């Protein structure tokens, strides 16, 4: 581990005991799985051996999650919920212990609602978390309802769109504290209100606060001259 | 190198090209299975040969951590930023030990400059709400 991660871990432990949901909104590549797998080792009071954590995530991330537990903190055993209907059922039925943590696709949790709801997932990870940025989503409408105590968001970039999408992430973190997306315009100075709301439950970085010895990107806007066949079709359109 | 594109049809064109110029290549459209994603990723890391990886920003990239890439190319740009920013950093991360270069390919006077202008206007709005 590293110092910014260890600060994030004592910050997590403070919010966990305070009963406060929040966002580990550090820049991409600073390491939100490594900054959260240590929860099982730090919150050592056997709660996490008697009952499960769970991870809600986009299908491509089911790569590293079922790998990283086995090399960072193999003390906690893991049973992913992805693959064929019959195969995931044959994994799942015996949760009705080895179930320290479970890893999931959004497009499975949005379907199998009853079969997740019947198990008391104590503490929640939700990941690449921009997926919840709209209250019109059947994802957001369902995911509000799981009876976990603490919800943790791993936003690879937080927020960063129109005010209904700010509200959609915020009202998933806190079901209270906020009245409506229409009134939340009042919650230059409105930026400082958003900052003073976010400061107690979102972390921040910028990579240079960690990466003293890794490169900045060279970024090239490369223009191209489109061809004859392109000009002919483009002009016809 | 990583190449990002937003049409599975364009990833087919890019595959037919990289087959044809004998590059060695590997692709992850949203039609690929979870076991296949895990196979392609673990074979793009750990191995010295595979020159180029083909991706979509809203499926192929998501948290997939290709530390073995040295460089990134956008053959497409989205109407929202952040997807491109994530797409870069799915290579540009603490597991690298290297220089990083990123390229965007754009046609002047077409429609992609509207996408870049909305992306710039959004990126400026998107900065102030963080820092």
């Amino acid at each position: 581990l590293k110092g910014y991660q260890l600060k994030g871990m004592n910050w997590l432990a403070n919010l966990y005991e305070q009963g406060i949901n929040g966002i580990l909104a550090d820049e991409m590549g600073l390491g939100k799985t490594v900054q959260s797998i240590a929860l099982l080792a730090h919150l050592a009071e056997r709660e996490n051996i008697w009952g499960p954590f769970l991870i809600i995530s986009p299908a491509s991330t089911l790569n590293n999650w079922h790998q990283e537990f086995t090399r960072f903190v193999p003390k906690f055993k893991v049973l992913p919920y992805w693959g064929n209907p019959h195969d995931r059922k044959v994994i799942r039925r015996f949760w009705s212990a080895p179930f320290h943590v479970v890893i999931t696709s959004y497009q499975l949790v949005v379907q199998d609602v009853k079969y997740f709801q019947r198990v008391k997932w104590q503490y929640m990870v939700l990941d690449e978390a921009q997926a919840l940025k709209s209250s019109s989503s059947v994802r957001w409408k369902i995911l509000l309802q799981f009876q976990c105590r603490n919800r943790l968001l791993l936003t690879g970039t937080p927020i960063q769109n129109t005010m209904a999408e700010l509200w959609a992430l915020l009202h998933f973190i806190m079901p209270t504290l906020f009245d409506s997306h229409e009134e939340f315009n009042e919650w230059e100075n409105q930026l400082s209100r958003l900052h003073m709301i976010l400061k107690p439950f979102m972390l921040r970085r910028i990579k240079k606060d960690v990466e003293n010895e890794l490169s900045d990107k060279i970024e090239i806007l490369m223009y191209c001259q489109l061809t004859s066949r392109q000009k002919l079709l483009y002009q016809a359109l | 190198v990583l190449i990002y594109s937003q049409m599975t049809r364009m990833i087919d064109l890019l595959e037919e090209y990289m087959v044809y110029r004998k590059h060695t290549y590997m692709r992850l459209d949203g039609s690929s299975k979870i076991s296949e994603r895990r196979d392609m990723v673990a074979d793009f890391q750990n191995r010295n040969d595979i020159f180029v990886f083909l991706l979509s920003t809203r499926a192929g990239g998501l948290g997939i951590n290709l530390t073995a890439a040295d460089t990134v190319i956008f053959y497409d740009s989205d109407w929202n930023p952040t997807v491109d920013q994530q797409a870069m950093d799915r290579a540009h991360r603490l597991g690298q030990t290297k220089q990083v270069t990123v390229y965007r390919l754009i046609c002047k006077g077409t429609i992609e400059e509207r996408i870049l202008q909305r992306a710039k206007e959004k990126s400026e709005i998107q900065r102030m709400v963080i820092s």
């Binding site: 049973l79 992913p80 693959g83 195969d87 044959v90 015996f94 080895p98 | 076991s35 196979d39 673990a42």
Partner: peptide, 29 residues
């Protein structure tokens, strides 16, 4: 005369974790 389920129970019980673990290691690659 009455404990006779145990020698059936054990044969299923050892299958549960084995097949769940087998499927959870198709998740290796």
């Amino acid at each position: 005369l009455t404990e006779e389920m145990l020698l059936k129970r054990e044969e299923r019980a050892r299958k549960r974790r084995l097949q769940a673990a087998r499927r959870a290691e198709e998740h290796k690659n």
